[PDB]
Every structure is written in structure tokens, then in C-alpha cells.
Design an enzyme around this catalytic site. Sequence first.
Site, PDB file in Angstrom:
ATOM      1  N   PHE A  36     -32.957 -11.315  18.003  1.00  0.00           N
ATOM      2  CA  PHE A  36     -32.128 -11.759  16.856  1.00  0.00           C
ATOM      3  C   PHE A  36     -31.133 -12.668  17.789  1.00  0.00           C
ATOM      4  CE2 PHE A  36     -30.483  -7.600  16.806  1.00  0.00           C
ATOM      5  CZ  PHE A  36     -29.044  -7.809  17.075  1.00  0.00           C
ATOM      6  N   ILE A  56     -19.427  -4.281  17.029  1.00  0.00           N
ATOM      7  CA  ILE A  56     -19.916  -2.992  16.347  1.00  0.00           C
ATOM      8  C   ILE A  56     -19.595  -1.954  17.029  1.00  0.00           C
ATOM      9  CG2 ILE A  56     -21.566  -4.494  14.869  1.00  0.00           C
ATOM     10  CD1 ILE A  56     -23.776  -3.333  17.053  1.00  0.00           C
ATOM     11  N   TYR A  82     -24.373  -2.853  11.475  1.00  0.00           N
ATOM     12  CA  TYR A  82     -23.988  -3.529  10.104  1.00  0.00           C
ATOM     13  C   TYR A  82     -24.092  -2.930   8.740  1.00  0.00           C
ATOM     14  CZ  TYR A  82     -22.805  -7.387  13.722  1.00  0.00           C
ATOM     15  OH  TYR A  82     -22.425  -8.024  14.931  1.00  0.00           O
ATOM     16  N   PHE A  99     -30.239  -2.799  21.733  1.00  0.00           N
ATOM     17  CA  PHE A  99     -29.618  -3.879  22.588  1.00  0.00           C
ATOM     18  C   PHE A  99     -30.007  -3.510  24.144  1.00  0.00           C
ATOM     19  CE2 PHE A  99     -26.753  -6.392  20.151  1.00  0.00           C
ATOM     20  CZ  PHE A  99     -26.782  -5.725  19.210  1.00  0.00           C
TER      21      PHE A  99
HETATM   22  O1  LIG Z   1     -20.611  -6.991  17.210  1.00  0.00           O
HETATM   23  C1  LIG Z   1     -21.253  -8.076  17.564  1.00  0.00           C
HETATM   24  C2  LIG Z   1     -22.523  -7.622  18.039  1.00  0.00           C
HETATM   25  C3  LIG Z   1     -22.404  -7.163  19.337  1.00  0.00           C
HETATM   26  C4  LIG Z   1     -21.858  -7.904  20.665  1.00  0.00           C
HETATM   27  C5  LIG Z   1     -22.650  -9.340  20.692  1.00  0.00           C
HETATM   28  C6  LIG Z   1     -22.649 -10.075  19.129  1.00  0.00           C
HETATM   29  C7  LIG Z   1     -21.502 -10.740  18.803  1.00  0.00           C
HETATM   30  C8  LIG Z   1     -21.984 -12.288  18.786  1.00  0.00           C
HETATM   31  C9  LIG Z   1     -21.834 -13.168  17.917  1.00  0.00           C
HETATM   32  C10 LIG Z   1     -22.157 -14.503  18.098  1.00  0.00           C
HETATM   33  C11 LIG Z   1     -22.946 -15.059  19.135  1.00  0.00           C
HETATM   34  C12 LIG Z   1     -23.190 -16.314  19.158  1.00  0.00           C
HETATM   35  C13 LIG Z   1     -22.960 -17.151  17.993  1.00  0.00           C
HETATM   36  C14 LIG Z   1     -22.488 -16.706  16.966  1.00  0.00           C
HETATM   37  C15 LIG Z   1     -22.075 -15.271  16.921  1.00  0.00           C
HETATM   38 CL1  LIG Z   1     -21.465 -14.661  15.228  1.00  0.00          CL
HETATM   39  C16 LIG Z   1     -21.396 -10.300  17.122  1.00  0.00           C
HETATM   40  N1  LIG Z   1     -20.502  -9.076  17.007  1.00  0.00           N
HETATM   41  C17 LIG Z   1     -19.090  -9.050  16.393  1.00  0.00           C
HETATM   42  C18 LIG Z   1     -19.344  -9.909  15.027  1.00  0.00           C
HETATM   43  C19 LIG Z   1     -18.522 -11.076  15.177  1.00  0.00           C
HETATM   44  C20 LIG Z   1     -18.711 -12.058  13.773  1.00  0.00           C
HETATM   45  C21 LIG Z   1     -19.542 -11.611  12.803  1.00  0.00           C
HETATM   46  C22 LIG Z   1     -20.308 -10.420  13.080  1.00  0.00           C
HETATM   47  N2  LIG Z   1     -20.305  -9.608  14.199  1.00  0.00           N
HETATM   48  N3  LIG Z   1     -23.406  -8.645  18.380  1.00  0.00           N
HETATM   49  S1  LIG Z   1     -24.772  -8.883  17.654  1.00  0.00           S
HETATM   50  O2  LIG Z   1     -25.912  -9.582  18.919  1.00  0.00           O
HETATM   51  O3  LIG Z   1     -25.134  -7.949  16.795  1.00  0.00           O
HETATM   52  C23 LIG Z   1     -24.797 -10.488  16.661  1.00  0.00           C
HETATM   53  C24 LIG Z   1     -25.423 -11.697  17.342  1.00  0.00           C
HETATM   54  C25 LIG Z   1     -25.294 -12.846  16.480  1.00  0.00           C
HETATM   55 CL2  LIG Z   1     -25.733 -14.369  16.977  1.00  0.00          CL
HETATM   56  C26 LIG Z   1     -24.867 -12.885  15.164  1.00  0.00           C
HETATM   57  C27 LIG Z   1     -24.459 -11.473  14.677  1.00  0.00           C
HETATM   58 CL3  LIG Z   1     -23.663 -11.128  13.048  1.00  0.00          CL
HETATM   59  C28 LIG Z   1     -24.362 -10.284  15.530  1.00  0.00           C
HETATM   60 CA   LIG Z   2     -18.284  -6.115  13.488  1.00  0.00          CA
END
Ligand SMILES: O=C1[C@@H]2CCC[C@H]([C@@H](/C=C/c3ccccc3Cl)CN1Cc1ccccn1)N2S(=O)(=O)c1cc(Cl)cc(Cl)c1
Ligand SMILES: [Ca+2]
Lengths: 107, 94
Positions: A36, A56, A82, A99
Site C-alpha cells: 500500500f 501506529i 488502524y 512492514f
Molecule cells: O503510522 C503511520 C504509518 C507507519 C509509518 C509510515 C506511514 C505514515 C506515512 C503517511 C504518508 C506518507 C506519504 C503520503 C501520505 C501519508 Cl498519510 C503514516 N503513519 C502515521 C499516520 C499519519 C497520518 C494518517 C495516518 N497515519 N504509515 S503507513 O505506511 O501505515 C501509511 C502510509 C500511507 Cl501512504 C497512508 C497511511 Cl494512512 C498509512
Molecule cells: Ca496514527
Amino acid sequence: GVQVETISPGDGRTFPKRGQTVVVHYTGMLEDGKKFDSSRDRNKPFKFMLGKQEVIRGWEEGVAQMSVGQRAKLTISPDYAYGATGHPGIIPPHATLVFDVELLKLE
Amino acid sequence: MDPEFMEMWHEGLEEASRLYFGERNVKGMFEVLEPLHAMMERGPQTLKETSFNQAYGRDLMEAQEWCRKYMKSGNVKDLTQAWDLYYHVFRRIS
Ligand SMILES: O=C1[C@@H]2CCC[C@H]([C@@H](/C=C/c3ccccc3Cl)CN1Cc1ccccn1)N2S(=O)(=O)c1cc(Cl)cc(Cl)c1
Ligand SMILES: [Ca+2]
Ligand SMILES: [Ca+2]
Ligand SMILES: [Ca+2]
Ligand SMILES: [Ca+2]
């Protein structure tokens, strides 16, 4: 919870401390294996501050167990991710996440 | 919690998130959300509208600010901040 399964060991000495900026490359997949998101696809290391719960729970606890240079697989149950809500548009409800994480440095 | 403000943000954020993460369409994401923000600017009215604003309104205003910043920066860190705020609200209204 979260399981950390080492692929390649870190230095065994330098671990994330509360308040440090943790710098990683990751790829996230659903339990079935569909990617994803990945920081490597945008060539941009991902950063977060340990203890802020900006990420998270599975990350907060899993990555804190890693030392610098380490590469590992984190398997994260929904309750440490989530949960029942999921995140709309990307993470379904009740999703186990997997991951691949590489701890690049601490700043 | 005003049922209509809850509903319009719930459905709005479902759509905005599908467009951004699923269809790689950041302009579409911003277009869906801009009128929801503008609706908040018009300011509360009911007791329930006021309650909604007190719980979520500052978080929503700041999420828009991060989006606007993304529009100049192109730094996904800014867009992440926005989603952090949007998701914080989404999760509480669902
Ligand atoms: O906790 C995470 C986890 C783990 C660290 C890296 C990213 C984090 C990266 C997000 C990100 C990256 C590039 C573009 C947009 C986003 Cl929101 C997100 N988060 C915290 C978070 C912020 C905002 C909303 C939801 N969750 N993740 S994730 O890979 O589960 C992920 C990626 C993306 Cl594109 C969106 C979500 Cl909702 C979660
Ligand atoms: Ca979070
Ligand atoms: Ca506040
Ligand atoms: Ca805040
Ligand atoms: Ca970020």
C-alpha cells in the site's frame, strides 16, 4: 501486538531513545502481500519522533527494538495499527499490516 | 455533535482519501475538501454545530493549512500532517 523478525542485524548498541528523530526506509503491505505504500518509491526516508505516538503503536514499539543499520519485518495486528476504523482510502478495517523496515539513523 | 456536520465530513474524508491514496489524485482530494472547510468558516449556529466546532474545528482548520502548504512545498511530510489531523477527526466521528 507487533513481532520483529530480523532480516539483517543492526549494530546491537545504538537504539532509538524517546525524543530522538528516527529515520527509516519502509515498505508497507496488507497481510495478503499487496503493497500500500513505500518510502523507497519516493526516495525519501521517513522520519518520526519516538514517544510522540505520531505513528501506529506497532511502529513505536517495534522500531524501538531495532538498532542502527538493522533491517527487519514488522508484523502488526490491527489493534496496534488502524484497528476497527482502518484508514479510509488505503487501510481496510481489521487489517494486519506487514512492514519491511530499515533503521537508517537517529537524529 | 451536529449530525449533518458529522455526516458531511465522514463522507467527504472517505471520498478525499479514495481520490488521494487510491486514485493518486491530490487535486481531486483538495477539491472535495475545500467546500467542507468553507462551510466551517461560515461559523456555527445550532448548539450541536458549536459542539462540533469545539471538538474538531481547530484540527480541521489546521489540516487545511497543511494542505495549502503542500500546494507550495510539494513535500509529502506536509500532506501527512494534514492526514494526521483529518484522520484524528474522522476516527472520532465514525
Ligand atoms: O503510522 C503511520 C504509518 C507507519 C509509518 C509510515 C506511514 C505514515 C506515512 C503517511 C504518508 C506518507 C506519504 C503520503 C501520505 C501519508 Cl498519510 C503514516 N503513519 C502515521 C499516520 C499519519 C497520518 C494518517 C495516518 N497515519 N504509515 S503507513 O505506511 O501505515 C501509511 C502510509 C500511507 Cl501512504 C497512508 C497511511 Cl494512512 C498509512
Ligand atoms: Ca496514527
Ligand atoms: Ca487544539
Ligand atoms: Ca494540535
Ligand atoms: Ca511525516
